[PDB]
What we know:
- The complex is a heterodimer of chains A (135) and B (599).
- Chain A is built from no helices and ten strands.
- Chain A is mainly beta and 135 residues long.
- Chain A has a single domain (1-135), classed as Sandwich (Immunoglobulin-like), CATH 2.60.40.
- In chain A, strands 1, 2, 5, 6, 7, 9 and 10 form a seven-stranded antiparallel beta sheet that branches.
- Chain A is globular and about 40 Å long.
- Chain A starts with a strand and ends with a strand.
- By secondary structure, chain B is mainly β.
- Chain B has one domain: Leucine-rich repeat, LRR (right-handed beta-alpha superhelix) (Alpha-Beta Horseshoe), CATH 3.80.10.
- Chain B has helices spanning 213-222, 365-368, 559-567, and strands at residues 3-6, 10-12, 31-33, 41-42, 55-57, 65-66, 79-81, 103-105, 127-129, 152-154, 162-163, 180-182, 190-191, 199-207, 226-234, 257-263, 284-288, 306-310, 327-331, 349-351, 359-364, 375-377, 383-391, 398-400, 405-407, 423-425, 432-433, 447-449, 454-455, 459-460, 472-474, 482-483, 496-498, 506-508, 520-522, 530-532, 544-546.
- In chain B, the strands form seven sheets. Chain B has a 24-stranded mixed beta sheet, with no helix packed on it. Chain B has a three-stranded parallel beta sheet with strand order 21-23-25.
- The longest helix of chain B has 10 residues, at 213-222.
- The chains are: A mainly beta (135), B mainly beta (599).
- Chain A binds chain B through residues 46, 48, 76, 78-84, 86, 88-92, 95-98, and chain B through 14-15, 35-36, 57, 59-60, 81, 83-84, 105, 107-108, 131-132, 156, 185, 208, 232, 236-239, 262, 264-265, 288-289, 310-311, 332.
- The complex binds a molecule of 3 linked components (NAG-NAG-BMA) (2 copies), a molecule of 2 linked components (NAG-NAG) and 2-acetamido-2-deoxy-beta-D-glucopyranose (9 copies).
- One 2-acetamido-2-deoxy-beta-D-glucopyranose binds at residues 280-281, 301, 303 of chain B.
Amino acid sequence: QQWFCNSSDAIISYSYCDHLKFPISISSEPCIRLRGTNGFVHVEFIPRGNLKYLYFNLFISVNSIELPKRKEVLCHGHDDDYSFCRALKGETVNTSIPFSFEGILFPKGHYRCVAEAIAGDTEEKLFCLNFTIIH
Amino acid sequence: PCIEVVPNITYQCMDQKLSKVPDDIPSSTKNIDLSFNPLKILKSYSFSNFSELQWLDLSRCEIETIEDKAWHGLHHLSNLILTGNPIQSFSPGSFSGLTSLENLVAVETKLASLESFPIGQLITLKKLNVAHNFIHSCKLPAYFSNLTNLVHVDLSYNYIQTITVNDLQFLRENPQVNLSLDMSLNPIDFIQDQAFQGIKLHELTLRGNFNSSNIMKTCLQNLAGLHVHRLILGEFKDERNLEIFEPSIMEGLCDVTIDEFRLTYTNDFSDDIVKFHCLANVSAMSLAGVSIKYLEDVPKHFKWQSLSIIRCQLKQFPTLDLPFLKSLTLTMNKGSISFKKVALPSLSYLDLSRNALSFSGCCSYSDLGTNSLRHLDLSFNGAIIMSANFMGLEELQHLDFQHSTLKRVTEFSAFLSLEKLLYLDISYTNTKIDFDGIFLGLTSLNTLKMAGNSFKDNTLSNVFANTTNLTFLDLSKCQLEQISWGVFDTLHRLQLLNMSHNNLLFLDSSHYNQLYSLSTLDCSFNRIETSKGILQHFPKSLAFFNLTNNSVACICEHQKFLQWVKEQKQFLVNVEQMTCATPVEMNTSLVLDFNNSTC
Ligand SMILES: *[C@@H]1O[C@H](CO)[C@@H](O[C@@H]2O[C@H](CO)[C@@H](O[C@@H]3O[C@H](CO)[C@@H](O)[C@H](O)[C@@H]3O)[C@H](O)[C@H]2NC(C)=O)[C@H](O)[C@H]1NC(C)=O
Ligand SMILES: *[C@@H]1O[C@H](CO)[C@@H](O[C@@H]2O[C@H](CO)[C@@H](O[C@@H]3O[C@H](CO)[C@@H](O)[C@H](O)[C@@H]3O)[C@H](O)[C@H]2NC(C)=O)[C@H](O)[C@H]1NC(C)=O
Ligand SMILES: *[C@@H]1O[C@H](CO)[C@@H](O[C@@H]2O[C@H](CO)[C@@H](O)[C@H](O)[C@H]2NC(C)=O)[C@H](O)[C@H]1NC(C)=O
Ligand SMILES: *[C@@H]1O[C@H](CO)[C@@H](O)[C@H](O)[C@H]1NC(C)=O
Ligand SMILES: *[C@@H]1O[C@H](CO)[C@@H](O)[C@H](O)[C@H]1NC(C)=O
Ligand SMILES: *[C@@H]1O[C@H](CO)[C@@H](O)[C@H](O)[C@H]1NC(C)=O
Ligand SMILES: *[C@H]1O[C@H](CO)[C@@H](O)[C@H](O)[C@H]1NC(C)=O
Ligand SMILES: *[C@H]1O[C@H](CO)[C@@H](O)[C@H](O)[C@H]1NC(C)=O
Ligand SMILES: *[C@H]1O[C@H](CO)[C@@H](O)[C@H](O)[C@H]1NC(C)=O
Ligand SMILES: *[C@H]1O[C@H](CO)[C@@H](O)[C@H](O)[C@H]1NC(C)=O
Ligand SMILES: *[C@H]1O[C@H](CO)[C@@H](O)[C@H](O)[C@H]1NC(C)=O
Ligand SMILES: *[C@H]1O[C@H](CO)[C@@H](O)[C@H](O)[C@H]1NC(C)=O
């Protein structure tokens, strides 16, 4: 199975990884454009662990060429910006976050990005997401 | 059954399709996780046997009915987590048996009111989390007087529209009661006049409460007559936002007596709202995650004793001079500012870490305008160029340059005037020691962390000759290959020495003589064939010697040393797992060398 949308310049699909198949109906509105978009990624799930201390492992792969591991902090534990950080294991999370992609001048045909949400506190996998961005 | 995370102590039965609690889990277990299981009804005398259980996770277990006497056996329980069970109605005696509880979490249990909530006999309780429910009443229940230890109450993501003089009429008759309270995400629109008149709170959290600055301004005004040690304010980046945040709203906060005022992410921010006159006589000013970009409109009458700037958006270093400012923190900064001269008479704590920050011309009175400086943190920054020698800042006793690119320190004698520094960390500042007097002047130094740098010709020079008062010294990961002669010879007071992860091939026992005070010598992970040089010479104060993961030559040439391994068995760490390095050895456990072949 998979889930996708078509931009006027890119098609983004995603499905759960090959081992961590924990739920999340993630989305976006409007569908992201490779070259600049202002919008809202919409989240709706039920976390297996406390979200305070959330961060992401972003393993990108452009044109079938793996990039360096990139860690992305979402919640620090002290007065986070997003409302969801305060969310507890088992809690229902239904929120929509605003973002601002600047835009790649000359973006190439094939993109890949796998995400692992990690509970910073207990180093435990929270969910895994596998994305594909085609031009 | 489950997952044994700590034998006879902690178990993980999260998401196992279990329908009842397992039956063959020890009675010694202290922590059990049963979240995400169809438990449905928490039967009576379920956890009867678990007399040492202190923490029980039942997060999202589809629990609809807490049966009578459910908590029977759990008189030692202290953490009870019930997030996301549809147990809408709690009949009295819900929490009977939990005679030791400090923490009840009934988040998203569909909890309607606190008056029905049967917790009044929970005398041990400290924290109560009731966020994400259907609580309409900001009433603080009368049974709270009994709850003599309960000091935190969160009611976030509930529906509370009105704080009324009666809601808080309990904090009134009880001024002696220290209570923190959070009602973020409540759609508050009306606070009754003179409501907070006469009440003290330690901390109060109001985030994402206000639809309009007008609803806000008006409401904020009636907080009048309240003492708050810490009031946090602002909103979320994903919730009911403000259209315009005008400095005017804070009017009325000019009644509420405040010690610490914390601002967080606002949708619309003016670099001036922080200058506002109702913030004049505050002792502690905190900004976290603020759309602030510049800060210099700070009047000299503002009675600030501390300032905290975290995860903010400054494009140039602030430029201030508040007379009574004791502590200053500026950390985790969006962009990459650069140091900028500032005069703070009362400054005794400077915290400047984790900003892509560059500083050139460090450091002296002029740089900061005080002598009283004891703490100084400059770690996790960029290019710190060493110019002057801390001249005028003698009272400084904590210097931290971790992972920040220090420049020109091998050049001069940088720390030359720091006769009181106790703690210096220059770890992973990517440094090469040429100069011999680098640490010259640090005669009060005790702790010297300096790992992952390097040395000229990978030889350990004589930079430690004057660092007499050293007790902790860390040369781990320093690509070392050799140690020069009288290197460690003055450290008649050192307790701990780390030379792990280097390239030492042997150890000259003579080096560590004169270390009359040494307890731990870590020489793990090295290319250490053996030691040589009177094995009796090692300090008789050394108790933990670490030679793990090495490469010990079990040759006859080292007969003496191989015996030393025995005489001093108990003092080496994991001696029993040490394996030889040389000829046919693998299955050949070091402590097994004999005494024959050629010798
Ligand atoms: C009334 O009760 C409050 C809440 O228990 C007391 O304030 C608390 O004071 C301690 C410090 O003495 C805080 O400890 C904290 O530990 C964390 C470690 O995670 C550390 O990072 C913090 O810097 C801090 O040291 C505790 O969190 C704090 N509670 C709150 C919510 O502010 C207070 O002592 C009592 N009031 C009075 C006036 O005595
Ligand atoms: C001497 O200095 C070294 C180097 O800094 C210290 O080595 C450290 O050893 C500990 C365990 O002995 C390491 O902790 C480890 O954490 C990782 C986290 O994933 C984990 O995989 C391991 O199971 C382990 O718990 C620590 O990281 C390691 N230092 C580094 C950065 O390599 C040693 O402790 C020092 N001895 C002292 C202080 O006397
Ligand atoms: C070599 O052995 C020592 C002690 O057996 C280990 O250091 C201990 O570990 C922690 C982690 O840094 C310290 O807090 C303790 O102070 C140390 N214990 C004592 C009594 O000194 C060290 O980790 C070992 N070497 C390695 C890298 O494994
Ligand atoms: C892709 O674009 C077409 C344009 O007609 C639109 O109708 C369609 O909904 C899009 N696909 C998706 C995301 O369903
Ligand atoms: C676990 O605890 C029980 C209870 O005392 C004990 O009898 C048993 O031997 C322990 N199991 C082991 C061997 O770890
Ligand atoms: C060397 O150490 C002594 C210790 O008393 C100190 O007084 C002196 O400043 C240091 N260096 C010299 C010789 O100036
Ligand atoms: C996504 O990445 C995974 C690694 O988790 C890989 O096995 C798979 O081929 C990729 N699938 C997609 C979305 O093309
Ligand atoms: C968010 O998710 C909930 C289910 O948890 C749903 O009922 C609600 O309508 C959603 N919000 C929106 C986008 O309307
Ligand atoms: C408690 O567990 C023990 C096994 O360790 C067993 O003897 C007893 O029947 C159990 N009691 C109940 C009713 O839960
Ligand atoms: C609190 O405890 C005292 C003594 O047991 C008692 O007087 C009071 O009524 C209790 N409050 C309730 C009913 O929770
Ligand atoms: C505040 O805005 C919300 C929409 O987010 C709306 O439902 C509510 O009625 C507004 N309050 C008023 C009366 O301005
Ligand atoms: C600080 O502001 C208060 C208003 O609460 C005022 O009474 C007082 O005069 C001011 N103190 C100073 C800076 O002299």
